[PDB]
A paper describes a structure:
As for all non-segmented negative RNA viruses, rabies virus has its genome packaged in a linear assembly of [name] (N), named nucleocapsid. RABV N is composed of two globular domains that are connected by a hinge, creating an RNA binding groove. It also comprises two subdomains, an N-terminal extension, named the NNT-ARM, and an internal loop in the C-terminal domain, named the NCT-ARM, that dock to neighboring subunits in the polymeric form and thereby stabilize the assembled NC. Thus, genome replication requires the production of the unassembled RNA-free N protein, named N0, in the form a complex named the N0−P complex, in which P prevents the polymerization of N and the illegitimate assembly with cellular RNA until N is transferred to nascent viral RNA.
In this study, we reconstituted a soluble heterodimeric complex between an armless N protein of rabies virus (RABV), lacking its N-terminal subdomain (NNT-ARM), and a peptide encompassing the N0 chaperon module of the P protein. The NΔ230−P68 complex crystallized with a single molecule in the asymmetric unit and the crystals diffracted up to 2.3 Å resolution. The NΔ230−P68 complex contained no RNA and an analysis with the webserver PDBePISA revealed no intermolecular interactions between neighboring heterodimers besides the crystal contacts (Complex Formation Significance Score (CSS) = 1.0 for the interaction between NΔ230 and P68 and CSS = 0.0 for all other contacts), demonstrating the absence of N polymerization in the crystal. In the absence of neighboring N subunits, the entire NCT-ARM (aa 350–400) was not visible in the crystal structure and a 5-residue loop in NNTD (aa 155–159) was also absent from the crystal structure, suggesting that it was flexible in the absence of RNA as expected, since this loop interacted with one of the bound nucleotides in the N−RNA complex. Two parts of P68 were clearly visible in the electronic density; residues from 4 to 15 were bound in a groove of NCTD with residues from 9 to 12 forming a helical turn, while residues from 20 to 39 formed a long α helix that docked at the interface between NNTD and NCTD. The binding of the P68 N-terminal moiety involved three H-bonds and four salt-bridges and buried a surface area of 1190 Å2, whereas the binding of the P68 C-terminal moiety involved thirteen H-bonds and three salt bridges and buried a surface area of 1617 Å2. As in other Mononegavirales N0−P complexes, the P chaperone module prevented the polymerization of N by interfering with the binding of the NNT-ARM and NCT-ARM subdomains from adjacent N subunits. The N-terminal part of RABV P68 competed with the NCT-ARM of the Ni+1 protomer, whereas the C-terminal part competed with the NNT-ARM of the Ni–1 protomer. Additionally, in the RABV NΔ230−P68 complex, the RNA binding groove in the N protein adopted a close conformation as in the N−RNA complex and in VSV NΔ210−P60 structure.
Residue numbers in the entry:
A (entry chain A): 27 to 154, 160 to 349, 401 to 447
B (entry chain B): 4 to 15, 20 to 39
Amino acid sequence: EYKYPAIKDLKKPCITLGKAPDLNKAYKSVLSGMNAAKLDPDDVCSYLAAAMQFFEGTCPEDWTSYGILIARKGDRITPNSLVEIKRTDVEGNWALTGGMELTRDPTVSEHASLVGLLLSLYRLSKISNYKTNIADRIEQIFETAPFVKIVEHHTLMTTHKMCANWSTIPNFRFLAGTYDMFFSRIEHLYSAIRVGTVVTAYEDCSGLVSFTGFIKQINLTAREAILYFFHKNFEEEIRRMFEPGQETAVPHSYFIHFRSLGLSGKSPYSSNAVGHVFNLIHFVGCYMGQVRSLNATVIAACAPHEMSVLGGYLGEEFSPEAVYTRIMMNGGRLKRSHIRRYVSVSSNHQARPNSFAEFLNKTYS
Amino acid sequence: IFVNPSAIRAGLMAEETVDLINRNIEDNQAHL
Protein backbone atom coordinates (compact mmCIF):
# COMPACT_ATOMS: atom_id res chain seq x y z
CA GLU A 1 0.00 0.00 0.00
CA TYR A 2 2.62 2.51 1.05
CA LYS A 3 4.86 3.82 -1.83
CA TYR A 4 3.56 4.96 -5.23
CA PRO A 5 6.40 4.77 -7.90
CA ALA A 6 6.05 8.22 -9.67
CA ILE A 7 9.49 9.91 -9.80
CA LYS A 8 9.00 13.40 -8.39
CA ASP A 9 12.39 15.06 -9.15
CA LEU A 10 13.39 14.23 -12.76
CA LYS A 11 16.14 11.81 -11.58
CA LYS A 12 16.67 8.61 -13.65
CA PRO A 13 16.64 5.35 -11.78
CA CYS A 14 20.17 4.90 -10.44
CA ILE A 15 22.49 2.17 -9.15
CA THR A 16 26.20 2.12 -8.24
CA LEU A 17 28.66 -0.56 -9.37
CA GLY A 18 32.46 -1.00 -9.44
CA LYS A 19 34.96 0.46 -11.83
CA ALA A 20 34.23 -0.11 -15.56
CA PRO A 21 36.08 -3.15 -16.82
CA ASP A 22 37.97 -3.81 -20.05
CA LEU A 23 35.03 -5.66 -21.84
CA ASN A 24 37.17 -8.51 -23.37
CA LYS A 25 38.54 -9.34 -19.99
CA ALA A 26 35.18 -9.07 -18.29
CA TYR A 27 33.67 -11.41 -20.91
CA LYS A 28 36.43 -13.98 -20.31
CA SER A 29 36.18 -13.87 -16.53
CA VAL A 30 32.35 -14.10 -16.56
CA LEU A 31 32.18 -16.91 -19.19
CA SER A 32 34.76 -18.78 -17.15
CA GLY A 33 32.44 -18.50 -14.07
CA MET A 34 29.39 -19.50 -16.05
CA ASN A 35 31.31 -22.68 -17.00
CA ALA A 36 32.46 -23.44 -13.46
CA ALA A 37 29.09 -22.48 -11.80
CA LYS A 38 31.05 -20.01 -9.75
CA LEU A 39 29.76 -16.55 -10.59
CA ASP A 40 30.44 -13.34 -8.70
CA PRO A 41 27.24 -11.24 -8.61
CA ASP A 42 29.03 -7.86 -8.44
CA ASP A 43 31.21 -8.79 -11.44
CA VAL A 44 28.14 -9.96 -13.41
CA CYS A 45 26.37 -6.67 -12.79
CA SER A 46 29.43 -4.60 -13.73
CA TYR A 47 29.79 -6.59 -16.95
CA LEU A 48 26.01 -6.39 -17.74
CA ALA A 49 26.06 -2.64 -17.37
CA ALA A 50 29.22 -2.18 -19.47
CA ALA A 51 27.83 -4.45 -22.24
CA MET A 52 24.91 -2.01 -22.73
CA GLN A 53 26.96 -0.08 -25.26
CA PHE A 54 26.65 -3.04 -27.71
CA PHE A 55 22.91 -2.85 -27.91
CA GLU A 56 22.34 0.36 -29.88
CA GLY A 57 19.06 1.13 -31.67
CA THR A 58 16.88 3.92 -33.03
CA CYS A 59 14.02 5.26 -30.89
CA PRO A 60 10.92 5.11 -33.11
CA GLU A 61 8.94 7.75 -31.15
CA ASP A 62 9.57 10.33 -28.42
CA TRP A 63 10.08 8.70 -25.02
CA THR A 64 9.29 10.46 -21.76
CA SER A 65 8.13 9.10 -18.43
CA TYR A 66 7.65 10.90 -15.11
CA GLY A 67 8.96 14.12 -16.74
CA ILE A 68 12.30 12.37 -17.67
CA LEU A 69 13.21 12.45 -21.34
CA ILE A 70 14.81 9.16 -22.42
CA ALA A 71 15.03 9.71 -26.18
CA ARG A 72 13.43 11.69 -28.95
CA LYS A 73 12.20 10.11 -32.16
CA GLY A 74 15.24 9.10 -34.17
CA ASP A 75 17.83 9.20 -31.31
CA ARG A 76 20.30 6.29 -31.27
CA ILE A 77 20.13 4.84 -27.81
CA THR A 78 21.20 1.95 -25.71
CA PRO A 79 19.74 0.65 -22.45
CA ASN A 80 22.14 2.91 -20.67
CA SER A 81 19.90 5.86 -21.76
CA LEU A 82 17.12 4.70 -19.47
CA VAL A 83 19.04 4.79 -16.21
CA GLU A 84 22.06 6.21 -14.44
CA ILE A 85 24.84 3.76 -13.67
CA LYS A 86 27.30 5.29 -11.24
CA ARG A 87 30.63 3.62 -10.81
CA THR A 88 33.24 3.63 -8.01
CA ASP A 89 37.06 3.60 -8.16
CA VAL A 90 37.12 -0.10 -7.00
CA GLU A 91 38.11 -2.69 -9.68
CA GLY A 92 36.08 -5.92 -9.76
CA ASN A 93 37.74 -9.27 -9.12
CA TRP A 94 37.54 -10.79 -12.62
CA ALA A 95 38.89 -14.27 -11.74
CA LEU A 96 39.44 -16.94 -14.30
CA THR A 97 37.98 -20.14 -12.83
CA GLY A 98 36.25 -22.52 -15.27
CA GLY A 99 37.10 -23.34 -18.88
CA MET A 100 38.51 -20.59 -21.14
CA GLU A 101 39.33 -21.96 -24.56
CA LEU A 102 39.21 -18.43 -26.06
CA THR A 103 42.51 -16.67 -26.48
CA ARG A 104 41.23 -14.06 -28.94
CA ASP A 105 38.81 -11.30 -28.12
CA PRO A 106 35.01 -11.95 -28.11
CA THR A 107 32.75 -10.64 -30.88
CA VAL A 108 29.65 -8.49 -30.24
CA SER A 109 27.62 -11.63 -31.16
CA GLU A 110 29.37 -13.55 -28.36
CA HIS A 111 28.80 -10.72 -25.78
CA ALA A 112 25.11 -10.65 -26.61
CA SER A 113 24.86 -14.41 -26.06
CA LEU A 114 26.56 -14.15 -22.67
CA VAL A 115 24.46 -11.15 -21.72
CA GLY A 116 21.41 -13.21 -22.76
CA LEU A 117 22.42 -16.24 -20.75
CA LEU A 118 23.28 -14.23 -17.65
CA LEU A 119 20.00 -12.39 -17.62
CA SER A 120 18.16 -15.70 -17.99
CA LEU A 121 19.31 -16.53 -14.45
CA TYR A 122 16.77 -13.88 -13.38
CA ARG A 123 13.83 -15.78 -14.82
CA LEU A 124 15.16 -19.18 -13.56
CA SER A 125 15.63 -17.74 -10.08
CA LYS A 126 12.13 -16.24 -10.14
CA ILE A 127 10.54 -19.66 -10.44
CA SER A 128 10.47 -21.11 -6.89
CA ASN A 129 12.02 -29.67 -12.91
CA TYR A 130 10.09 -27.39 -15.30
CA LYS A 131 13.28 -25.20 -14.99
CA THR A 132 15.05 -27.67 -17.37
CA ASN A 133 12.31 -27.22 -19.96
CA ILE A 134 12.87 -23.43 -19.68
CA ALA A 135 16.66 -23.69 -19.53
CA ASP A 136 16.95 -25.95 -22.61
CA ARG A 137 14.85 -23.58 -24.69
CA ILE A 138 16.95 -20.60 -23.48
CA GLU A 139 20.24 -22.36 -24.35
CA GLN A 140 18.86 -23.02 -27.84
CA ILE A 141 17.83 -19.37 -28.38
CA PHE A 142 21.34 -18.28 -27.51
CA GLU A 143 23.01 -20.73 -29.98
CA THR A 144 20.87 -19.56 -32.83
CA ALA A 145 22.06 -16.71 -35.08
CA PRO A 146 22.24 -13.79 -34.35
CA PHE A 147 23.57 -15.36 -31.11
CA VAL A 148 26.61 -17.69 -31.03
CA LYS A 149 27.21 -20.88 -29.10
CA ILE A 150 29.65 -20.12 -26.27
CA VAL A 151 28.63 -22.76 -23.66
CA GLU A 152 27.77 -26.47 -23.65
CA HIS A 153 24.26 -27.80 -23.20
CA HIS A 154 23.27 -28.09 -19.50
CA THR A 155 25.72 -25.40 -18.33
CA LEU A 156 22.91 -22.91 -17.66
CA MET A 157 20.97 -25.18 -15.27
CA THR A 158 24.15 -26.13 -13.39
CA THR A 159 25.00 -22.51 -12.85
CA HIS A 160 21.38 -21.63 -11.95
CA LYS A 161 21.45 -24.28 -9.23
CA MET A 162 24.28 -22.13 -7.68
CA CYS A 163 22.48 -18.82 -8.38
CA ALA A 164 18.95 -19.77 -7.35
CA ASN A 165 18.29 -16.54 -5.37
CA TRP A 166 19.72 -14.00 -7.81
CA SER A 167 16.25 -12.60 -8.59
CA THR A 168 16.32 -10.63 -5.29
CA ILE A 169 19.87 -9.20 -5.72
CA PRO A 170 18.79 -5.60 -6.26
CA ASN A 171 21.45 -4.57 -8.79
CA PHE A 172 20.88 -7.67 -10.92
CA ARG A 173 17.11 -7.20 -10.77
CA PHE A 174 17.67 -3.56 -11.78
CA LEU A 175 19.72 -4.58 -14.85
CA ALA A 176 17.10 -7.17 -15.89
CA GLY A 177 14.37 -4.54 -15.67
CA THR A 178 16.44 -2.00 -17.65
CA TYR A 179 17.19 -4.51 -20.45
CA ASP A 180 13.49 -5.55 -20.51
CA MET A 181 12.28 -1.93 -20.77
CA PHE A 182 14.80 -1.19 -23.55
CA PHE A 183 13.83 -4.21 -25.67
CA SER A 184 10.08 -3.62 -25.04
CA ARG A 185 10.46 -0.22 -26.76
CA ILE A 186 13.18 -0.95 -29.34
CA GLU A 187 12.65 -3.90 -31.71
CA HIS A 188 16.31 -5.06 -31.82
CA LEU A 189 18.45 -7.81 -33.38
CA TYR A 190 19.00 -9.25 -29.85
CA SER A 191 15.37 -8.74 -28.54
CA ALA A 192 15.07 -12.43 -27.74
CA ILE A 193 17.04 -11.59 -24.55
CA ARG A 194 13.56 -10.81 -23.13
CA VAL A 195 13.15 -14.58 -22.72
CA GLY A 196 15.03 -13.98 -19.42
CA THR A 197 13.79 -10.53 -18.41
CA VAL A 198 10.11 -10.48 -19.45
CA VAL A 199 9.07 -11.53 -15.93
CA THR A 200 10.17 -8.07 -14.62
CA ALA A 201 7.16 -6.57 -16.42
CA TYR A 202 4.50 -5.67 -13.84
CA GLU A 203 6.28 -7.39 -10.89
CA ASP A 204 4.37 -6.73 -7.61
CA CYS A 205 1.27 -5.66 -9.48
CA SER A 206 -0.76 -8.93 -9.20
CA GLY A 207 -3.81 -7.11 -7.83
CA LEU A 208 -3.86 -4.59 -10.67
CA VAL A 209 -3.17 -7.29 -13.30
CA SER A 210 -5.94 -9.60 -11.94
CA PHE A 211 -8.32 -6.65 -12.03
CA THR A 212 -7.56 -5.72 -15.62
CA GLY A 213 -7.57 -9.39 -16.70
CA PHE A 214 -10.94 -9.84 -14.99
CA ILE A 215 -12.47 -6.87 -16.88
CA LYS A 216 -11.38 -8.44 -20.22
CA GLN A 217 -12.73 -11.83 -19.27
CA ILE A 218 -16.24 -10.70 -18.32
CA ASN A 219 -16.13 -8.64 -21.48
CA LEU A 220 -17.29 -5.32 -20.02
CA THR A 221 -16.08 -1.76 -19.94
CA ALA A 222 -14.15 -0.69 -16.86
CA ARG A 223 -16.95 1.69 -15.78
CA GLU A 224 -19.61 -1.08 -16.03
CA ALA A 225 -17.36 -3.68 -14.29
CA ILE A 226 -16.65 -1.38 -11.28
CA LEU A 227 -20.41 -1.41 -10.54
CA TYR A 228 -20.22 -5.08 -9.62
CA PHE A 229 -17.65 -4.37 -6.87
CA PHE A 230 -20.28 -3.13 -4.47
CA HIS A 231 -18.99 -4.29 -1.13
CA LYS A 232 -17.75 -1.28 0.95
CA ASN A 233 -14.08 -2.41 1.30
CA PHE A 234 -13.62 -2.28 -2.50
CA GLU A 235 -13.85 1.51 -2.56
CA GLU A 236 -10.44 2.34 -1.10
CA GLU A 237 -8.84 -0.49 -3.12
CA ILE A 238 -10.14 0.74 -6.43
CA ARG A 239 -9.10 4.31 -5.49
CA ARG A 240 -5.66 3.01 -4.64
CA MET A 241 -5.16 1.47 -8.05
CA PHE A 242 -6.23 4.62 -9.96
CA GLU A 243 -4.18 7.15 -8.06
CA PRO A 244 -3.38 9.88 -10.64
CA GLY A 245 0.06 10.65 -12.00
CA GLN A 246 1.32 7.04 -11.98
CA GLU A 247 1.29 6.42 -15.73
CA THR A 248 -0.55 3.08 -15.66
CA ALA A 249 -1.94 4.04 -19.11
CA VAL A 250 1.28 5.38 -20.64
CA PRO A 251 2.98 3.08 -23.17
CA HIS A 252 6.63 2.19 -22.19
CA SER A 253 6.52 4.18 -18.88
CA TYR A 254 8.93 3.39 -16.06
CA PHE A 255 5.68 2.30 -14.34
CA ILE A 256 5.87 -1.04 -16.13
CA HIS A 257 9.19 -1.90 -14.50
CA PHE A 258 8.88 0.16 -11.33
CA ARG A 259 9.59 -2.59 -8.86
CA SER A 260 12.68 -4.00 -10.57
CA LEU A 261 14.15 -0.52 -11.05
CA GLY A 262 13.56 0.24 -7.37
CA LEU A 263 11.03 3.09 -7.76
CA SER A 264 9.13 1.54 -4.81
CA GLY A 265 9.70 -1.30 -2.43
CA LYS A 266 6.05 -1.32 -1.27
CA SER A 267 3.65 -1.76 -4.14
CA PRO A 268 0.07 -0.45 -3.83
CA TYR A 269 -0.97 -2.73 -6.70
CA SER A 270 0.09 -6.10 -5.27
CA SER A 271 -2.28 -8.91 -4.31
CA ASN A 272 -1.96 -7.96 -0.61
CA ALA A 273 -2.50 -4.29 -1.21
CA VAL A 274 -5.85 -4.83 -2.97
CA GLY A 275 -6.66 -8.02 -1.14
CA HIS A 276 -10.44 -7.78 -1.16
CA VAL A 277 -10.50 -7.20 -4.85
CA PHE A 278 -7.97 -9.97 -5.51
CA ASN A 279 -9.92 -12.43 -3.31
CA LEU A 280 -13.17 -11.71 -5.09
CA ILE A 281 -11.70 -12.03 -8.55
CA HIS A 282 -10.21 -15.42 -7.77
CA PHE A 283 -13.27 -16.76 -6.03
CA VAL A 284 -15.04 -15.94 -9.27
CA GLY A 285 -12.32 -17.84 -11.16
CA CYS A 286 -12.84 -20.77 -8.77
CA TYR A 287 -16.61 -20.78 -9.42
CA MET A 288 -15.84 -20.94 -13.21
CA GLY A 289 -13.32 -23.77 -12.84
CA GLN A 290 -10.14 -21.82 -13.60
CA VAL A 291 -6.99 -23.51 -12.43
CA ARG A 292 -5.04 -20.26 -12.16
CA SER A 293 -7.54 -19.00 -9.59
CA LEU A 294 -7.84 -22.33 -7.66
CA ASN A 295 -4.00 -22.43 -7.18
CA ALA A 296 -3.61 -18.69 -6.27
CA THR A 297 -2.99 -17.77 -2.64
CA VAL A 298 -5.79 -16.31 -0.56
CA ILE A 299 -5.27 -12.95 1.12
CA ALA A 300 -6.11 -14.08 4.67
CA ALA A 301 -6.67 -10.58 6.07
CA CYS A 302 -9.17 -9.43 3.42
CA ALA A 303 -12.50 -11.09 4.43
CA PRO A 304 -12.15 -14.12 2.25
CA HIS A 305 -15.37 -15.62 3.67
CA GLU A 306 -17.36 -12.58 2.52
CA MET A 307 -15.50 -12.34 -0.79
CA SER A 308 -16.45 -16.00 -1.44
CA VAL A 309 -20.14 -15.16 -1.04
CA LEU A 310 -20.02 -12.24 -3.40
CA GLY A 311 -17.97 -14.44 -5.75
CA GLY A 312 -20.72 -17.02 -5.90
CA TYR A 313 -23.30 -14.44 -6.96
CA LEU A 314 -20.95 -12.81 -9.44
CA GLY A 315 -19.97 -16.27 -10.63
CA GLU A 316 -23.71 -17.07 -11.05
CA GLU A 317 -24.05 -14.03 -13.43
CA PHE A 318 -21.28 -14.69 -15.97
CA SER A 319 -27.11 -6.17 -14.52
CA PRO A 320 -25.16 -5.23 -11.28
CA GLU A 321 -28.47 -4.15 -9.67
CA ALA A 322 -29.86 -7.67 -10.27
CA VAL A 323 -26.90 -9.21 -8.38
CA TYR A 324 -27.14 -6.85 -5.47
CA THR A 325 -30.86 -7.70 -5.26
CA ARG A 326 -30.29 -11.41 -4.96
CA ILE A 327 -27.63 -11.02 -2.31
CA MET A 328 -29.79 -8.74 -0.05
CA MET A 329 -32.84 -11.00 -0.61
CA ASN A 330 -30.79 -13.96 0.60
CA GLY A 331 -29.51 -12.12 3.60
CA GLY A 332 -25.95 -12.03 2.32
CA ARG A 333 -25.75 -15.86 2.37
CA LEU A 334 -24.78 -18.28 -0.38
CA LYS A 335 -27.48 -20.50 -1.79
CA ARG A 336 -27.13 -24.28 -1.67
CA SER A 337 -26.67 -24.12 -5.47
CA HIS A 338 -23.57 -21.89 -5.12
CA ILE A 339 -22.10 -24.14 -2.46
CA ARG A 340 -22.71 -27.31 -4.53
CA ARG A 341 -20.85 -25.69 -7.40
CA TYR A 342 -17.85 -24.34 -5.39
CA VAL A 343 -17.44 -27.82 -3.75
CA SER A 344 -17.79 -29.62 -7.11
CA VAL A 345 -14.80 -27.69 -8.39
CA SER A 346 -12.60 -27.48 -5.29
CA SER A 347 -13.11 -31.05 -4.20
CA ASN A 348 -11.96 -32.31 -7.63
CA HIS A 349 -8.82 -30.20 -7.59
CA GLN A 350 -5.25 -30.85 -6.36
CA ALA A 351 -5.54 -28.18 -3.62
CA ARG A 352 -2.28 -26.41 -2.64
CA PRO A 353 -1.59 -25.02 0.83
CA ASN A 354 -3.06 -21.53 1.40
CA SER A 355 -4.80 -21.68 -2.02
CA PHE A 356 -8.30 -20.65 -2.91
CA ALA A 357 -9.14 -24.37 -3.55
CA GLU A 358 -8.01 -25.30 0.00
CA PHE A 359 -10.02 -22.43 1.51
CA LEU A 360 -13.14 -23.61 -0.35
CA ASN A 361 -12.64 -27.24 0.80
CA LYS A 362 -12.02 -26.19 4.38
CA THR A 363 -14.92 -23.72 4.43
CA TYR A 364 -17.77 -25.36 2.48
CA SER A 365 -17.00 -29.09 2.33
CA ILE B 1 -21.71 -3.58 4.10
CA PHE B 2 -23.14 -4.07 0.58
CA VAL B 3 -23.84 -0.73 -1.15
CA ASN B 4 -26.44 -0.36 -3.93
CA PRO B 5 -24.95 -0.22 -7.52
CA SER B 6 -27.55 2.34 -8.75
CA ALA B 7 -26.03 4.57 -6.00
CA ILE B 8 -22.57 3.79 -7.47
CA ARG B 9 -23.49 5.36 -10.84
CA ALA B 10 -22.27 8.79 -9.41
CA GLY B 11 -18.36 8.48 -9.41
CA LEU B 12 -15.48 9.82 -11.59
CA MET B 13 -8.16 6.97 -17.17
CA ALA B 14 -9.08 3.39 -16.11
CA GLU B 15 -10.35 2.32 -19.50
CA GLU B 16 -6.93 2.73 -21.17
CA THR B 17 -4.95 1.33 -18.24
CA VAL B 18 -7.06 -1.80 -18.64
CA ASP B 19 -6.48 -1.82 -22.37
CA LEU B 20 -2.66 -1.12 -22.10
CA ILE B 21 -1.93 -3.61 -19.38
CA ASN B 22 -3.89 -6.46 -21.09
CA ARG B 23 -2.23 -5.82 -24.43
CA ASN B 24 1.28 -5.68 -22.90
CA ILE B 25 0.64 -8.94 -21.11
CA GLU B 26 -0.62 -10.51 -24.38
CA ASP B 27 2.68 -9.50 -26.07
CA ASN B 28 4.81 -10.61 -23.21
CA GLN B 29 3.43 -14.12 -23.88
CA ALA B 30 5.66 -14.45 -26.91
CA HIS B 31 8.69 -14.33 -24.59
CA LEU B 32 7.49 -16.85 -21.99
